[PDB]
């Protein structure tokens, strides 16, 4: 059972990659009782650059083939109390995203759910809440509202909405 991210154009099979991390943005509200909302960061490439874990692969929202963390998932941010400051989440165990060439790539829903749970646990330890809600990207250009990546000299765009739509409790 897998999550299917639809991609345009169809990514060839040799573009299958390893999600080693991602970049998030917390939705405005600070203390909304106990539910904190995060979304995939759709800002500037320099945010991904300031994360400094993305590796050599050009990618938005999700870091492909980047550097993984040593022991456990680690979240970082210039300022936790600021929403404009992005959240660089470095995974500990990569999640393989496999592309078939049929216009969509696939991610194991069990592995992605475990990754989301670990991310939510670390975000809960940081922001001191309980409920973590991953919501989709709140608009922008095609390169940052979608998960985009350059492979084989071609830029591919994949709707990552089904990766960021879940609730995680304590």
């Amino acid at each position, epitope marked *: 059972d897998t999550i299917t991210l639809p991609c345009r154009p169809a990514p060839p099979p040799h573009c299958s990659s390893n999600i080693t991390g991602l970049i998030l943005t917390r939705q405005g509200g600070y203390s909304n009782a106990n539910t904190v909302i995060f979304r995939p960061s759709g800002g*500037d*490439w*320099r945010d991904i650059a300031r994360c400094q874990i993305a590796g*050599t692969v*050009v990618s938005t929202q999700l870091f492909l083939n980047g550097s993984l963390a040593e022991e456990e998932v680690v979240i970082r941010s210039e300022d936790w109390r600021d929403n404009a400051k992005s959240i660089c989440v470095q995974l500990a165990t990569s999640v393989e995203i496999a592309c078939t060439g049929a216009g969509h790539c696939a991610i194991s829903r069990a592995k992605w759910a475990n990754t989301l749970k670990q991310i939510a646990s670390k975000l809960r330890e940081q922001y001191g809440a309980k409920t973590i809600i991953f919501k989709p990207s709140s608009g922008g250009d095609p390169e940052f509202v979608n998960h985009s990546f350059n492979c084989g*000299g071609e830029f591919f765009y994949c709707a990552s909405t089904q990766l960021f739509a879940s609730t995680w409790f304590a």
Partner: antibody
Amino acid sequence: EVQLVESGGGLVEPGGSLRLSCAASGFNFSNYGMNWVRQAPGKGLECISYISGSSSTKYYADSVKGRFTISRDNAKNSLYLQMNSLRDEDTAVYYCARDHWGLDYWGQGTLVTVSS
Amino acid sequence: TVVTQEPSLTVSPGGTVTLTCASSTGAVTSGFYPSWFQQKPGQTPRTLIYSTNNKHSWTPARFSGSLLGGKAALTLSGVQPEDEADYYCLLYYGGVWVFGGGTRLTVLG
């Protein structure tokens, strides 16, 4: 198609001022940072200045700090370089380059000759 | 902060040449987002490689970016006579782009 077109340039007397303009088409100009990169005749490339998409971040090279001023109008798809206190060392072809994982798209370049 | 390239290199057609790009501030990593530009005489610099090794659609297949010994490396394998140009290396220093000195590549054939 991404297009960057420089205007301004030409002859300027030493100590005078000039304003380079760069009109952008084919992309959401507000969604990308911009760079001014100059090249003296017969010399290498030098990255002069950078302005962020919201014109919030501006970096300047040491050689042009305090003299050059980078600006932009997003509603007009225009990038601007206000060059003041020009010296003979500022004579160069000035290129306008988009900031997208590097300098992926450049302008055709406009020659600025500082001569009395 | 100086970004250093070989001033000139010479290669026969069909051969292989490797241009190196070193940073005075430590060793070049993937976070320096190296770019390689090709400038034929009087032409606008043209991006061949960005982010260590990514290519544009217009980049010829024979060009390849890489990282050896803390230096960025542009490898031209199977040189063609029109590959003769100046190759500038561009490094990223936390928001500050810094160009290299350039390398004059002469196809000696």
